[PDB]
Amino acid sequence: MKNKQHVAIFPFPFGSHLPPLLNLVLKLAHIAPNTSFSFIGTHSSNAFLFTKRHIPNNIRVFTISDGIPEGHVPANNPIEKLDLFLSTGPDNLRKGIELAVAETKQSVTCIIADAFVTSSLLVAQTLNVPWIAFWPNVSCSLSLYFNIDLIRDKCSKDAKNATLDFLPGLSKLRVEDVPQDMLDVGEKETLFSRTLNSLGVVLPQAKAVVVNFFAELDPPLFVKYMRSKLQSLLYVVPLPCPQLLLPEIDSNGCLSWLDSKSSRSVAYVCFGTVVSPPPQEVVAVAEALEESGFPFVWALKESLLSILPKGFVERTSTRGKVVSWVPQSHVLSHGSVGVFVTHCGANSVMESVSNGVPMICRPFFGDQGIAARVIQDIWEVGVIVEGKVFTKNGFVKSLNLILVQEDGKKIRDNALKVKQIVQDAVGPHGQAAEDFNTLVEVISSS
Ligand SMILES: COc1cc(-c2[o+]c3cc(O)cc(O)c3cc2O)cc(O)c1O
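The line above is the sequence of UDP-glucose:anthocyanidin 3-O-glucosyltransferase; the predicted structure tokens follow.
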């Protein structure tokens, strides 16, 4: 009997949502080299992943519309392009299915999609095939989508520091930690935010939900709570497959520089690539790094070099690196790095906690505030920067706290404890090992 298994993959075709899903498909394609995997992206998303890379032959790439008609120029906000792609609907997706079916001569037996591509659930129901949701976001934020009415009711009536005790295992979460887009109603409501607010209804219809995180790092009551809301909640280790990482050159010379510093002494700063912070904070971050005296690697926009204080990069050159790019995963896995100043992106948090590096947190939007709260009040592996925004005096006090002071010994100790938990979790007898195989069997019997 010939193998007729054919998995259709629908990523959220944007930046940070692309590597973690290809990473999962790579592992799946390796353990099941007889099963066909059809990765369906846009021209820009496919150019992003598959340009340099070489992939196993049972993975095939197909192209659909980005939702941006030719001639049109999207505005400089990170939401429009997401909206335009989401507006393509299930018909654009089914076009990707057509390309897959025509190439493999196999009908689709299973679909794996990023949870945001909620239209792929519609496709899965039409084909009568199981729908598997991939969650590359902050894991703890899954619970929010099943209590939107309560969250909205509390965020309006109650104080901003009021706790969300109705969230099992996440009582530490506050009103001010809630993503703004699930509070926005009316004109400020986007197709992207309408999609995200549909998750509490969309997610339970999934055969399985695959969380790109370590099951042992989430509050047990949260995990249990989500298992009550979903048909299946699976965790698969977010650490890269050997096929994922691309051999890249240390052009800036970050690593060799880090070897010249002593253990846990360097501050690594990178506040995202999606949202640019207000120039006054950029000035404040620069001012704080200089006043502090600590060695630092600052991954900064090339376009933000002009708003930096005059002479800053030059006066700090003998103890600091201001660069356009860093091999972040390698930088965070270096012993010299003592603190990670982050916007709290799901991937950045993953990379920091798995390397025992404590974090100074300044969340900008989305689930980054959920991440920040967990880092500070739950895992206790870092702090939100004083005042929730970057200031010269506040950020220096955060740097001092984590890097050198005895008051931050608990946090540095917890950073090491969590790393050990991750190292054990990615082990052969961790949860994900059992869960990864559950996923393979779902695909096998699809
Ligand atoms: C990488 O592409 C983007 C992702 C996101 C994004 O927004 C979220 C918002 C939330 O409220 C909650 C989330 O979990 C998000 C995750 C994202 O990746 C937002 C953008 O403006 C983007 O451009």
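Note on the example: The pocket of P5M is lined by residues 14-17, 78-79, 82, 137, 141, 179, 181, 196, 274, 366-367 (CB under 6 Å). The longest strand covers residues 36-42.
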